[PDB]
Symmetry: D2
Subunit: 42 residues, 4 copies
């Protein structure tokens, strides 16, 4: 499965329910760019 041995994984506590969803959203956003970032050019 390509192994999850990418960068070290971490965690962060976020108080607030609505605010939490907001942080997670930014995280998935960067992960999405990384998907097209490692996309071979051409």
């Amino acid at each position: 499965k390509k192994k999850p041995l990418d960068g070290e994984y971490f965690t962060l506590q976020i108080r607030g329910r609505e605010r939490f969803e907001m942080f997670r959203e930014l995280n998935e956003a960067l992960e999405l760019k990384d998907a097209q970032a490692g996309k071979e050019p051409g």
Copy 2:
């Protein structure tokens, strides 16, 4: 100690070491504003 019974607490996994510190920074930023937000006016 005013009890930690504020909003429900949550957590988020952030891959990458440098990126992790970045997310945590934004979290502490909002928490700082909340400190002066609950500061009685006058």
Copy 3:
């Protein structure tokens, strides 16, 4: 060109050069998700 009449556009001043690039990065991240968000399912 599909017209740029989407949501109203706005602007934000960000002091600091390194910090500025950081904000712009988050903006492009959300815009990327929106691209796959409006992607017809199936």
Copy 4:
């Protein structure tokens, strides 16, 4: 007034009204920490 000659100022266009307010919020958050960051210790 201490002169606004701090780091170079910049700008960023953010589509969406609700989203715009969100970005501006993060900006003010970092600026708040900077205020207590330049606060002489002791």
